[PDB]
Symmetry: D2
Subunit: 96 residues, 4 copies
């Protein structure tokens, strides 16, 4: 029936409108993350380095980059993001 057709299309339209910005936002966020990736590389190599440890043992006080957890947590976040991405890839592959 025509009215079924109408309902069905209106429902799809609303579904598109709720979904599409989520796709656009992930695309944009991924791209920006990629553009700034060297900053993560720099910060990660800084944290491993002997220099970091030297500087973390100053005599004030450590809240940022020399903090106990800041950079460790950033890396933890990065690594957990990688997991989430790895879980998503096979699902996306089955919906191409």
């Amino acid at each position: 029936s025509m009215k079924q057709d109408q309902l069905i299309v209106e429902k799809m339209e609303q579904t598109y409108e709720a979904f599409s910005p989520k796709l656009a936002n992930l695309i944009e966020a991924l791209d920006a993350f990629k553009e700034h990736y060297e900053e993560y590389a720099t910060l990660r190599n800084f944290y491993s380095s002997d220099e970091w440890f030297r500087l973390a043992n100053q005599p004030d006080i450590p809240c940022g980059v020399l903090s106990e957890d800041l950079l460790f947590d950033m890396i933890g976040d990065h690594n957990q993001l990688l997991a989430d991405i790895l879980d998503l890839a096979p699902i996306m592959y089955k919906h191409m």
Copy 2:
């Protein structure tokens, strides 16, 4: 010694402050995309169905029955998968 240190630190701090929100934003955007994925599944199965074609070819559609709205959405999804597959090995080397 304690002025050169300050300058090294100030550079790192600035690097963190430029970078960290990009990480947070990607985390959040990924999660929201995941949460709404079934909507993409639904739309994708709608587009490939005979019903879509019947509905689209009736007697103009700028939405879901338009010529390329959903095609482009799938195209965008598929290109996002490619970018994700390129990013994974890079991230795997910086854990």
Copy 3:
């Protein structure tokens, strides 16, 4: 106890022995696949070419046969399914590092 320890260890040793070569073989097979990947690329681009279709409708017929109806299609299908399996495996391996 020492005897019980020895039996636990023997079980692990066997587990290593059963498993280790499956790792080593996959590593070797992967590498060889990578090395020969251009052969797949060539064959794939041949199959999707207009030339393939022309040549498949000629009267040599039928070799069974790079010009066969499904040889190269199946090879691509196998490649694609291999990518799926790889994608499913990656997250599992990521949780056992």
Copy 4:
């Protein structure tokens, strides 16, 4: 007759390549079949029980190197995936 030349080349390319695909497929799925053994060995290595003539599984490096090999295989797989994705 250009044709027969071209075909012969492809046929030879297929015959060189196809077993490399089959072998990877078969190696992958045998690795899958036996994955729980890797899991068990990995959890064994990290355990308190493990602290306890030793050249095999109780060796300094055997299990460490196995994990190292596993982890490098993952890297190689992650590199391969995007390439395969462009040739479907």
